[PDB]
Design a protein around this ligand. Structure first.
Ligand SMILES: CCC1=C(C)/C(=C/C2=NC(=C\c3[nH]c(/C=C4\NC(=O)[C@H](C)[C@H]4CC)c(C)c3CCC(=O)O)/C(CCC(=O)O)=C2C)NC1=O
Ligand SMILES: CCC1=C(C)/C(=C/C2=NC(=C\c3[nH]c(/C=C4\NC(=O)[C@H](C)[C@H]4CC)c(C)c3CCC(=O)O)/C(CCC(=O)O)=C2C)NC1=O
Ligand SMILES: CCC1=C(C)/C(=C/C2=NC(=C\c3[nH]c(/C=C4\NC(=O)[C@H](C)[C@H]4CC)c(C)c3CCC(=O)O)/C(CCC(=O)O)=C2C)NC1=O
Ligand SMILES: CCC1=C(C)/C(=C/C2=NC(=C\c3[nH]c(/C=C4\NC(=O)[C@H](C)[C@H]4CC)c(C)c3CCC(=O)O)/C(CCC(=O)O)=C2C)NC1=O
Ligand SMILES: CCC1=C(C)/C(=C/C2=NC(=C\c3[nH]c(/C=C4\NC(=O)[C@H](C)[C@H]4CC)c(C)c3CCC(=O)O)/C(CCC(=O)O)=C2C)NC1=O
Lengths: 160, 158, 162, 161, 160, 160, 158, 160
């Protein structure tokens, strides 16, 4: 989390937390209620967010679910929706942790190699994650949506 | 029609007494919850078409028979009238949500409606099922803020 | 490197004085623009790949000889290095905009770059054209005030090269 | 709309005066307020009044009376010579009340205003195309009448048609 | 109230609330606490406004309480101050509601016919309400004075 | 505008402006500088918003520019973008006026019949307007986005 | 009807352009004067009866022959119609003063008034003298802010 | 029906049937065999006409069955075919009646706002009905085809 990153920093120079790092930890603990609210909204609405994101992604890119597409078939389409759900849950983790470390550890490191070898079109994943980002922003206030969009765009930029 | 402030004023006027501390407190409670109710009403207004579409989908998925030949929703015109009545209920629920009082519903919606549905042949229980479906649709978007007014419409029908 | 705050700090340390009203005005001015800078940096970071795609496409459309045989950007390696350098310029302009000071462009970018490009044979006029293309593309994403700010650092890079 | 708004609107539409200038129809107003008569029945009560005949028939030619009736109860003007002549004949042989009744029972009135709205003008071609045998002429006359709504024109009725 | 006027406008056109009516409602809800303050200070001191205004009205025209006058006698003066108290309470109601409607339904619709039948001098009532406006502004801040003065002036204008 | 509706309401009862109507007018005049700021922002970024909304709409709904599509061709796409700019200017007018009457009188009245005759897909127009709303909300703060979205949503509702 | 802001909007729309710097300056200037115009309107509304009373006094002091038998203001009915006209002029001048634009006077006051006055034999110069007397009264009461609107009515009759 | 229309025309003027109305009714009664023949041919080929018209529509406008189309999905394509069959039944009604009243009161009145709310593309419906017109013209002779084409064209014009 943010706390872990500050602790790792202070440990590299073998010192106690500095005023800046205390400010980071304090401002993170201050944001706890807002992060919990955002994560609750994204978590309780994961099903409709993933359904909507998948619908938008498939309308935008029909060839994925057309014969010969990477997502063609019930099983492959199910795994596609499961990947979108995975990335939504990773976004919730990133919101809760106040940094992108859990997203990197669980989902991003190796996802480029994984998708290259499975022949999964990364732009399609980006389209689905953008759709999920707008579907989440529909469910959140302006500040909460802005908070979630940071981690959504972080996922997108790691893809691209 | 009345709202919360007007009904309080009427209650004090019936007794011919100036406002007391309890009356002022109730007024302040109404004023405090104003922004949330306005935001809920604005969200409903911005999404009226989608709410209508998905509530009609829920109603006619639960009770397909209305859309079959012989059903009271079987025509272009009777289906249009059904979704039109649902629009009535939604718009007046928004009005009562802003006002904080159900009198607008009783006057503009429920006044003579049960007898009219009997005269036309409209199945009231199915209409109540539609109002409950729209309750669920609106709760999925704005929370439980507007449940009271939809319940009032449903009980007035029932 | 030096940001605007540490720039004020360095001036006042060298002259050995506590902050006065003028220093506090400079610091208030930096803090007031801080949210715009953070927003622009987040927007550029989210869009950096798109900015580079658009800018490289405009540059190679305006100068098709770069990517055809005999051009400095003709091979997969030299094309990759070209757009890599464009990634440099975008990233370091974003750093300088977030810091509100061009010192990082002197230390980390412009020092020895003309000599590197002249030794390699990399055409510097075309590099300036690419920097201009990135300036317009970035301005197309970030909005009026952020565009005007980022353009300062893009122009600093252009002047340091050209 | 409240009963007060409806009453003031009806007095302006039918008698071209505010209620304070007039001797109000107290019993008709009470019936409308109590809701056992419609706005249309109040409009007919205003038309049946002796004050209507004093305002719009005592000092007018029958063509002007027809124009007044069309402005008040339909919100427009007679467009053709056949329509104006037929209404003049109604006034001159059956009386003012029967002519006003013919205006109120007309399909034009039922479509535009029905039973609960005060009549009003509408400067739209849909207002006249299906209903009137001279739709463009009907629009021209209605627009001229609205343009100078304050005036009671003395330009001859058959010169306009 | 101010809400009822906006909702009536929306209902007349058979549509949802427009941005302008939403703005009106937001303004009224923002003004609510000032409204409650003004209404409370007016309510707590009703006795003294009524007494001062009645006194000033009586001195300004003695013929009201002189023999042959409408307010001549003890009972008729009691009804006089009762009317002043009524109008003050309606002024507080209008301050709270944000519109003049409660003043209209409760006190001023039909007051002209009533006072004409009772041969009550409308100029005398207007002098009483004026005196009430001065007494009210006497114990209000300038902003609250203007807020109450709008409704006092409305009562006076509708009286004539 | 906001003033016009209050003045007409006063004219309905043949009276001067009531305290409530004056409150409406005063609130609008207070909001004027915020309205001018937002309108200026949407005006300077007219090309910004129009290009962003057009790209978002064409990517969301590509059959508009696909062969047989309504906007197929440079000229028809230019006219589509011009319609988007028209609606952007109308949103600015609605922001400035404080109501939706300029939008109706210039753009909304008769647009449904016009587009029906031209076989212009209204859902695509809704997509364009919603995309323009997102683009403009990007360039504004939270509040300014709120009021700009008010008129964007009015346009969306009136088109549908 | 239009107000100042809608007039500026129509001006920019006739040219098919967004608001420029000058347009925003003009709109800001209108917004800046709004508080003063509202104060003037409220001041006029508070004393409308007294303004009308002394305006009619001025008119009929200048021209006593209007009240004498055979004058155009000799009957209870014609005197009442005259002071009702002046009350109309004051109220609609106040409306225009609030709006900052004279279109309300064109739509609601001058829509056939000159033709009506020529038809009925109402003397137009005497009416303009009365309008001018009311303009002077209101100017002495609130200042010059409303003069133009009264002049507009005069120009609609002259 | 034709007889209903003539009787209503007689009734509105409170009179017996006019010689012109009698001629209308007589001519309608003469055309009875031809109407029954056209309607019988249409009803016997209901499934064939519906399949052919739907197929023609679906190549003509493949965006409808494409992902993101209004008719994409087996339920929605089935409902599309069911509405085509509805309008074919209504066309048979109009042929038998000699008037367009059954078409209006069963399927035409309210279909405009219904399809607006369902986002059903009216041009697609018109193409489907034109395809059904072609299918009927194939099955009918020239005179029968013209007679049915009257009501097919009436439906087309009503939809637009
Ligand atoms: C929790 C962290 C985590 C991630 C992120 C993750 C991604 C992931 N997705 C996979 C397969 C897949 N992923 C997709 C998704 C694609 N379908 C379309 O093309 C879209 C563009 C795109 C999604 C939006 C599909 C279709 C497959 C199956 C491909 C195959 O069977 O060869 C696989 C290979 C093993 C498997 O079948 O599950 C991984 C590892 N797995 C994880 O455990
Ligand atoms: C000598 C080594 C070398 C290579 C190979 C090379 C490729 C190359 N391909 C380009 C464009 C392109 N290349 C392709 C080829 C793709 N189209 C389909 O997707 C296929 C899968 C695939 C080819 C089989 C396309 C479509 C473009 C245009 C892309 C665009 O402009 O958006 C460009 C951009 C400039 C230009 O158009 O000339 C380069 C530099 N450059 C080099 O210096
Ligand atoms: C049944 C016979 C009939 C006709 C023909 C007719 C014409 C007619 N056109 C009108 C308005 C109009 N008519 C037009 C048409 C013009 N715009 C120009 O660019 C074109 C050269 C030209 C059309 C080809 C326009 C633009 C208006 C609006 C005028 C306005 O609102 O200021 C109006 C005013 C009422 C309304 O707006 O609906 C009428 C009455 N009325 C009838 O009853
Ligand atoms: C709300 C918009 C509105 C306006 C503006 C208006 C003016 C107006 N004044 C009228 C008559 C009149 N107007 C006057 C006033 C004149 N007497 C002269 O001595 C004075 C110089 C002058 C006034 C200062 C008089 C005396 C009449 C009666 C004419 C008559 O009965 O012969 C009339 C003819 C109908 C009637 O008397 O009720 C109108 C329409 N009416 C309206 O509804
Ligand atoms: C007997 C008179 C009658 C008519 C005319 C009628 C039309 C009709 N079609 C409907 C749905 C529908 N209608 C269509 C057909 C359209 N969409 C396709 O893209 C085509 C372009 C086009 C047909 C050519 C579709 C696909 C639906 C499903 C929409 C949904 O349920 O989400 C509905 C909503 C109720 C329902 O889903 O069952 C009605 C009322 N219903 C009637 O009772």
């Amino acid at each position: 989390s943010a706390i872990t990153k500050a602790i790792l920093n202070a440990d590299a120079e073998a010192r106690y937390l500095s005023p800046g790092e205390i400010d980071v930890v304090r401002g993170y603990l201050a944001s706890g209620e807002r992060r919990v609210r955002v994560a609750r909204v994204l978590s309780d609405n994961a099903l409709r967010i993933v359904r909507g994101a998948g619908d938008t992604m498939f309308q935008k890119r029909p060839d994925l679910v057309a014969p010969g597409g990477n997502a063609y078939g019930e099983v492959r389409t199910a795994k596609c929706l499961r990947d979108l759900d995975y990335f939504l849950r990773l976004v919730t983790y990133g919101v809760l942790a106040g940094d992108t470390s859990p997203i990197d550890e669980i989902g991003l490191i190796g996802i480029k190699e994984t998708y290259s070898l499975l022949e999964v079109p990364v732009p399609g994943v980006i389209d689905g994650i953008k759709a999920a980002k707008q579907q989440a922003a529909a469910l959140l206030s302006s500040e909460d949506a802005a908070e979630a969009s940071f981690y959504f765009d972080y996922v997108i930029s790691a893809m691209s | 029609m009345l709202d919360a402030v007007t009904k309080i004023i009427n209650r004090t006027d019936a007794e011919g007494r100036y406002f007391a501390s309890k009356d002022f407190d109730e007024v302040t409670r109404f004023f405090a919850t104003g922004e949330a109710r306005l935001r809920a009403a604005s969200t409903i207004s911005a999404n009226a078409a989608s709410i209508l579409r998905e509530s009609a989908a829920a109603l006619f998925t639960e009770q397909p028979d209305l859309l079959r030949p012989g059903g009271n929703a079987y025509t272009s015109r009777r289906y249009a009238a059904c979704v039109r009545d649902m629009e009535y209920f939604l718009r007046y629920a928004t009005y009562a949500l802003v006002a904080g009082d159900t009198s607008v519903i009783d006057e503009r919606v429920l006044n003579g409606l049960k007898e009219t549905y009997m005269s036309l042949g409209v199945p009231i229980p199915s209409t109540v099922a539609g109002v409950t479906a729209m309750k669920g649709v609106v709760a999925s978007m704005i929370g439980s803020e507007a449940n009271v007014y939809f319940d009032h419409i449903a009980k007035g029908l029932s | 490197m030096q940001d605007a705050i540490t720039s004020v700090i360095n001036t006042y340390d060298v002259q050995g004085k506590y902050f006065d009203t003028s220093a506090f005005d400079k610091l208030k001015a930096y803090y007031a623009t801080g949210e715009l800078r953070v927003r622009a940096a987040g927007t550029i970071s989210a869009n950096a790949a798109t900015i580079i795609k658009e800018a490289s496409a405009k540059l190679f459309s305006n100068q098709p000889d770069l990517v055809r045989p005999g051009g400095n950007a003709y091979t997969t390696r030299r094309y990759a290095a070209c757009v890599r350098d464009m990634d440099y310029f975008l990233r370091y302009a974003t750093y300088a905009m977030l810091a509100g000071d061009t010192s990082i462009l002197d230390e980390r970018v412009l020092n020895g770059l003309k000599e590197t490009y002249n030794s390699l044979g990399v055409p510097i006029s075309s590099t300036v054209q690419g920097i201009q293309a990135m300036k317009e593309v970035t301005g197309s994403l970030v909005g009026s005030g952020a565009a005007k700010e980022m353009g300062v650092y893009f122009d600093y890079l252009s002047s340091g090269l050209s | 709309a409240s009963v007060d708004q409806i009453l003031r609107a009806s007095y302006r539409q039918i008698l071209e005066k505010e209620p304070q200038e007039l001797q109000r129809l107290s019993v008709a107003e009470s019936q409308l307020r109590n809701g056992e008569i419609s706005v249309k029945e109040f409009i007919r009560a205003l038309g049946y009044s002796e004050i209507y005949a004093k305002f719009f028939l005592a000092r007018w030619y029958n063509g002007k009376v027809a124009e007044f009736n069309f402005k008040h109860f339909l919100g427009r003007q007679p467009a053709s010579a056949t329509e104006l002549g037929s209404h003049i004949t109604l006034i001159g042989t059956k009386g003012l009340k029967v002519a006003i009744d013919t205006l109120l029972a007309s399909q034009e009135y039922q479509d535009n205003f029905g039973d609960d709205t005060v009549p009003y003008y509408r400067l739209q071609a849909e207002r006249y195309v299906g209903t009137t045998d001279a739709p463009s002429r009907a629009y021209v006359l209605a627009r001229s009448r609205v343009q100078t709504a304050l005036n009671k024109p003395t330009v001859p009725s058959y010169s306009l048609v």
